[PDB]
Ligand SMILES: O=C(O)C(=O)N[C@H](Cc1ccccc1)C(=O)O
């Protein structure tokens with residue numbers, strides 16, 4: 095949609111020139127009120143929606159590098175680096191299988207004050223490197239910050255968890271990123287409530303059934319759950335169906351909360367020239383399995399089946415490397 | 431090898447002109463004595479071999495249409511028909527899934543005397559149709575025939591079953607076929623002892639690892655376990671790897687016993703212009719699973735894994751028809 099207008103006539107929140115350009119078409123994601131029945135409907139049907147008045151992270155809306163560094167306590171925060179705007183999320187617990195894989199992003203633990211310094215350093219030296227802080231909110235958090243945390247709207251979110259019959263909140267990540275930073279398309283196996291705090295983030299989502307268009311890496315690969323297709327330079331040779339992809343986009347700002355249904359693909363980028371961005375997500379385990387499979391199956395359920403096959407086949411063969419050969423042996427001249 | 435010579439200088443048992451011609455190369459299967467250590471070795475390593483002095487079906491060597499019709503009792507025998515020399519073995523318990531499948535062979539129960547008549551009829555009327563009797567040896571068998579059965583060398587075969595740790599004899603089929611009759615390539619999940627009684631049969635076998643060259647039908651298909659490749663007119667377009675196939679052949683005659691290891695492909699044909707052929711097989715369940723998978727895996731073990739995947743995937747999807755689509759969705763642009 096068109097750039098929303100800020101109250102008090104402070105001008106447009108952002109402008110098209112801050113968004114990156116891509117080859118596929120997109121339609122806006124609904125921006126509704128938490129009290130709007132249609133929104134309660136979209137969630138109930140595992141469809142994305144942006145809630146604008148939940149007050150989920152109200153106490154955190156005052157956060158910023160300064161305030162944070164002062165009260166965030168003194169613990170270790172994981173900080174990812176990148177020579178480019180695209181951040182390569184890789185699982186270190188799978189690098190064994192694909193020894194032929196070399197990471198294009200380096201993680202590093204550090205104190206907040208350090209992170210801030212390393213950041214103010216780049217900016218103050220006309221560098222080109224980019225950073226991104228992603229750390230769970232444990233107990234090593236300052237006292238004052240714990241006050242803000244307790245300030246979150248748990249009354250509302252706890253009812254969503256209940257009404258939807260989801261599992262237990264697995265974690266909350268604090269995400270602080272630099273403008274221009276990008277998180278390549280991928281999907282997560284948990285329900286997510288993306289709570290925007292500082293800055294603006296453009297989020298482009300794709301339904302689970304778009305599986306054939308996004309070509310995710312093999313399950314045993316370090317980049318499992320991520321799309322192999324380079325959005326900046328799509329290889330229609332290897333990934334022919336990326337020319338059929340159609341997504342849903344929107345730009346979340348301070349106070350907004352985006353619901354990302356489990357298994358839904360999502361590409362997230364921080365607006366160009368929009369200062370830093372701060373967000374806090376809420377990951378919950380999806381509702382348990384009906385124990386009485388009812389057909390027809392939903393798209394994400396099939397993806398669960400595929401993932402399973404790959405996992406079990408790598409067990410049987412005792413080697414994840416042979417998973418591919420066996421699958422081709424199974425299909426060539428028989429199923430294709 | 432070259433046509434063996436019959437004792438008493440009765441001339442060659444058969445001549446090349448009786449065998450069908452095929453595009454692939456083949457090497458002879460070992461013809462050894464049951465007391466030969468090398469033969470006990472081939473069996474222990476699940477490799478084919480022809481034993482010439484087991485005396486397994488000694489009492490049955492005197493069988494023929496006449497003697498049989500008289501003592502075979504009076505029960506129902508399954509008799510398959512075919513307009514061509516190739517017999518289409520289809521599973522009636524799977525015809526549901528592939529309703530788009532129409533059998534090219536008609537089975538029919540009948541009394542022996544009837545079978546003989548229907549047979550002597552064709553021959554006596556210059557017909558072209560072909561028949562093949564395949565029936566288990568139950569209790570509806572004549573008394574005199576039971577005497578022959580009891581005459582089999584159970585002392586020897588029971589030790590093979592024991593030494594190899596195989597399961598229990600699942601069944602014994604009486605196979606009576608017309609000259610020129612052919613049983614297309616396929617494999618069985620049980621250990622087999624092919625006991626030739628009357629006539630000569632050419633058997634061409636392929637190791638389990640030739641899976642990629644024989645393109646078996648889908649597991650849920652009525653012709654599961656059978657090769658899709660037409661040996662008389664190979665379609666190298668669909669089945670490219672059939673040009674890499676290499677088999678082991680041999681011609682079994684009265685008194686010979688062929689060991690067909692479980693999962694080994696086999697094409698069986700009755701010599702051209704060689705009268706009828708009578709055989710009796712012995713199917714045993716392979717040795718149980720080690721319960722402690724020891725790698726590297728053997729070829730037939732992987733085929734067991736593939737079969738499993740197909741079976742379970744058709745369960746999960748609740749429809750065997752979608753098995754193919756999902757497999758391609760899994761591999762395209764990811765594993766190929
Ligand atoms: O949406 C589905 O249920 C489905 O089977 N979709 C397939 C593609 C697909 C298959 C499996 C998972 C996701 C997507 C299709 O050809 O449309």
Ligand SMILES: O=C(O)C(=O)N[C@H](Cc1ccccc1)C(=O)O
Nearest residue numbers: 183228269277282286288362375
């Ligand atoms: O919240 C998410 O699910 C998510 O993908 N967040 C990304 C950052 C991220 C990347 C990888 C793992 C967790 C979080 C973002 O740029 O907002």
Ligand SMILES: O=C(O)C(=O)N[C@H](Cc1ccccc1)C(=O)O
Nearest residue numbers: 423638639640641642729732733
């Ligand atoms: O023989 C094997 O163990 C094996 O994995 N053979 C594969 C082909 C094959 C795979 C699985 C079963 C039978 C045959 C090959 O490319 O040679």
Ligand SMILES: O=C(O)C(=O)N[C@H](Cc1ccccc1)C(=O)O
Nearest residue numbers: 519564605613618622624698711
């Ligand atoms: O004994 C076998 O395994 C076998 O494939 N015998 C075939 C006949 C047959 C075909 C199908 C099922 C059982 C038996 C033959 O022509 O000798």
Ligand SMILES: [Fe+2]
Nearest residue numbers: 280281282360
């Ligand atoms: Fe994510």
Ligand SMILES: [Fe+2]
Nearest residue numbers: 616617618696
């Ligand atoms: Fe067979």
